[PDB]
């Protein structure tokens, strides 16, 4: 029964919840287990980067996050094509590739091919047979400079262009931001009905002259 002022509460405990309760007493054990597995995997892929393949630069989808950039699933086929890496060879040198991602603009495409080129310059390719190097790399640099990179490969950072203070021009001072927004909203709202009324006026004009 309600008692004086309060909040109308709707607890979701009508459904035998006590049989399905997930305790978390194995959480520290799970953290230990995952950490040990990570260490073992890093040991297994001895000079290769621990975190894994290099991921592309990707812009977050919706209107809430599209000002932000994160790591994607893999480099697109167009990116690999214009960077000059075979799509079946990239996955062996540690480049992730997403065959289902397209590129809608050229700026993201160019940023990701610059990323691929920089990674390709940073790569140290060991020869397949250590005694005989065919086209991999120089032993002088691969003997010393080869170490296991920790963390993501070239981690994706959000870059902000610095805006230097400038003198405000009279055009900027005369621009009406609120009126521009209101008129833009009205124009987008009434674009279709205006076109229909213009078509009907064309029909009226021809029937009046005829």
């Amino acid at each position: 029964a309600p008692s004086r002022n309060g909040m109308v509460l709707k607890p979701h405990f009508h459904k035998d919840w006590q049989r399905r309760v997930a305790t978390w007493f194995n959480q520290p054990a799970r953290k230990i287990r995952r950490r040990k597995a990570r260490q073992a995997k890093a040991r297994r892929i001895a000079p290769r980067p621990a975190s894994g393949p290099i991921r592309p630069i990707v812009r977050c989808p919706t209107v809430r996050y599209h000002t932000k950039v994160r790591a994607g699933r893999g480099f697109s086929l167009e990116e690999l094509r214009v960077a000059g890496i075979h799509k079946k060879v990239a996955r062996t040198i540690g480049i992730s590739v997403d065959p289902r991602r397209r590129n809608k603009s050229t700026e993201s495409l160019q940023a990701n091919v610059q990323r691929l080129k920089e990674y390709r310059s940073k790569l140290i390719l060991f020869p397949r047979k250590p005694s005989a190097p065919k086209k991999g790399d120089s032993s002088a640099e691969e003997l010393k400079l080869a170490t296991q990179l920790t963390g993501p490969v070239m981690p994706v950072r959000n870059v902000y262009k610095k805006e230097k203070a400038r003198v405000i021009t009279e055009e900027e001072k005369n621009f009406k931001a609120f009126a521009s927004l209101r008129m833009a909203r009205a124009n987008a709202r009434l674009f279709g009905i205006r076109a229909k009324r213009a078509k009907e006026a064309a029909e009226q004009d021809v029937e009046k002259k005829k």
Partner: protein, 147 residues
Amino acid sequence: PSRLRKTRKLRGHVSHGHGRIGKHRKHPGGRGNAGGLHHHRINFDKYHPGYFGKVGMKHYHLKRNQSFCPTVNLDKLWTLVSEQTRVNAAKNKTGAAPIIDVVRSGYYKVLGKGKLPKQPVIVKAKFFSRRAEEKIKSVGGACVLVA
């Protein structure tokens, strides 16, 4: 700590604080929000007006990201940039005004609560309010729009 509770003090008192006449029974009055229109009507009308009935249009598949638009007021506008920016702008001999991009700081709309200091400033935002734009222009600033 169970040693700090009324149950420790209620040992020896037969009814445990629930009365001898009305007792402590299972569910007198119903379970949950039972009878909110019948025998708890006074409570519901008194403390939760508007509880019963429908109002407005329903909208399936609401995506809150579409309507995401955080706002910042003009009185907090100058806190989005460093102290050095404002000080240098104040002591600048030229007409160079700093740019505050509120989208970079994480806001889309600039609202016009509060007053601004008397310094020209270029504000970049997705949306403006009429009074925010008026107050920005009154200090000699400008409002530019971004998408």
